[PDB]
Design a protein around this ligand. Structure first.
Ligand code: HEM
Ligand SMILES: [C-]#N
Length: 161
């Protein structure tokens, strides 16, 4: 069933829901609700989909979809499409410390950003993920629209039954 390469990341599999917040120098701060699904099809990658919506009115905000590849155990390539007209490849590493997994990725570690002609200018994205039992937390830093690399997002999600 599960590819041997994915064994360390098996706790990621399933549905996650929670809430986060974000900011950037060029915008007003915001909050969001988030739903994530990790799945697989028997190969050395997870499938991944995210949908976010406004806490106030449940209006859809951001989504993202793609794949978490294991480039040999310990190595990850996160490959994503964004509905804002942007593609992202983040590269990095993970550690297992008992029930804690830590993933550290960046477009800056031989990753990629692609921009559609009508997209906003994003030039780097960094992601830090922590899975501690039934809790998934992350921060995302962004270099974009004239601003240095800095926080855009962070959230805390919980495993769904
Ligand atoms: C949970 C995921 C995310 C949420 C809820 C979110 C939410 C928002 C919101 C509400 C804004 C301000 C309103 C707007 O410009 O549409 C914004 C701006 C922005 N976001 Fe995000 N975002 C998320 C992820 C991302 C990702 C992954 C990227 C890059 C791929 C990104 C890039 C930007 C940029 C470039 C801006 C515009 C800044 C400007 O116009 O100066 N966001 N985000
Ligand atoms: C982010 N839109």
């Amino acid at each position: 069933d599960l590819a041997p390469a994915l064994q360390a990341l098996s706790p990621l599999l399933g549905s996650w829901a929670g809430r986060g917040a974000g900011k950037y120098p060029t915008i007003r701060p915001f909050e969001y609700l988030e739903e994530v699904v990790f799945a697989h099809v028997g190969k050395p990658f997870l499938t991944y989909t995210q949908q976010t919506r406004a806490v106030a009115d449940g209006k859809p905000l951001h989504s993202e979809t793609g794949y978490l590849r294991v480039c040999r155990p310990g190595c990850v390539e996160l490959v994503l499409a964004h509905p804002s007209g942007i593609t992202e490849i983040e590269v990095g590493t993970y550690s297992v410390t008992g029930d804690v997994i830590e993933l550290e990725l960046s477009t800056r570690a031989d990753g990629s950003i692609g921009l559609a002609p009508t997209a906003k200018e994003v030039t780097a994205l960094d992601r830090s993920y922590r899975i501690d039992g039934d809790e998934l937390s992350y921060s995302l830093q962004m270099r974009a629209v004239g601003q240095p690399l800095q926080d855009h997002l962070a959230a805390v999600l919980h495993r769904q039954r």
